[PDB]
């Protein structure tokens, strides 16, 4: 199917992220991804909380078990509702934190961008 992709553009973003064609299981693990029983790898981080477990947003990413496609989204602190952290630059602290997190993935051959 088409739900896992090789590129993702977060809601509102001007950048697109691409899954590295050379992404490695052990590197995913080293960056904090957890492999589920299905073989897929997941990662989640809170963004810009006001108090413990009161995040403004969360970043979620899953890589498929075959290591050839991914999903990545921003949601609100409830972990479900789609969020747009970029529109009108209304959430700069969340964007800085997101970029910091993803910069590590760029440096370790997980994601690229244009
Ligand atoms: Cl499909």
Author numbering: 0 to 113
Paper quotes:
The structure of LP2179, a member of the PF08866 (DUF1831) family, suggests a novel α+β fold comprising two β-sheets packed against a single helix. The LP2179 gene of Lactobacillus plantarum, a lactic acid-producing bacterium found in human saliva and intestinal flora, encodes a protein with a molecular weight of 12.6 kDa (residues 1–113) and a calculated isoelectric point of 8.9. A remote structural similarity to two other uncharacterized protein families specific to the Bacillus genus (PF08868 and PF08968), as well as to prokaryotic S-adenosylmethionine decarboxylases, is consistent with a role in amino-acid metabolism. Genomic neighborhood analysis of LP2179 supports this functional assignment, which might also then be extended to PF08868 and PF08968.
The final model includes 114 residues (i.e. the residual Gly0 from the expression tag followed by residues 1–113 of LP2179), one glycerol molecule, one chloride ion and 195 water molecules in the asymmetric unit. The side chains of Lys8, Lys59 and Lys86 were not modeled owing to poor electron density. The Ramachandran plot produced by MolProbity shows that 98.2% and 100% of the residues are in favored and in favored and additionally allowed regions, respectively. LP2179 forms a single domain composed of two antiparallel β-­sheets packed against a long C-terminal helix H3. A second helix, H1, links strand β2 from the first β-sheet (order 127), which is assembled from the two N-terminal and the C-terminal β-strands, to the second β-sheet (order 3456) and packs parallel to H3. Analysis of the crystallographic packing of LP2179 using the PISA server and analytical size-exclusion chromatography in combination with static light scattering indicate that a monomer is the likely quaternary form. The H2 helix, which is absent in both YugN-like and DUF1885 homologs, might constitute an additional difference, but owing to its short size (one helical turn) and its involvement in crystal contacts (Asp88–Arg107′ and Phe85–Arg107′) it might not represent a biologically relevant conformation of this region in solution. Among these TBP-like variants, LP2179 is unique in that the N- and C-terminal β-strands are combined to form an additional β-sheet that is situated between the central β-sheet and helix H3. In LP2179, a strand is added at both the N- and C-termini, while YugN-like homologs contain an extra β-strand at the N-terminus (topology β2-α-β4-α) and PF08968 homologs contain an additional β-strand at the C-terminus that follows a circular permutation of the core fold (topology α-β4-α-β2). Although the catalytic residues (Ser and Glu) of the AdoMetDC proenzyme are not conserved in LP2179 and YugN-like or Pfam08968 homologs, sequence alignment reveals the conservation of charged and aromatic residue clusters between LP2179 and YugN-like homologs.
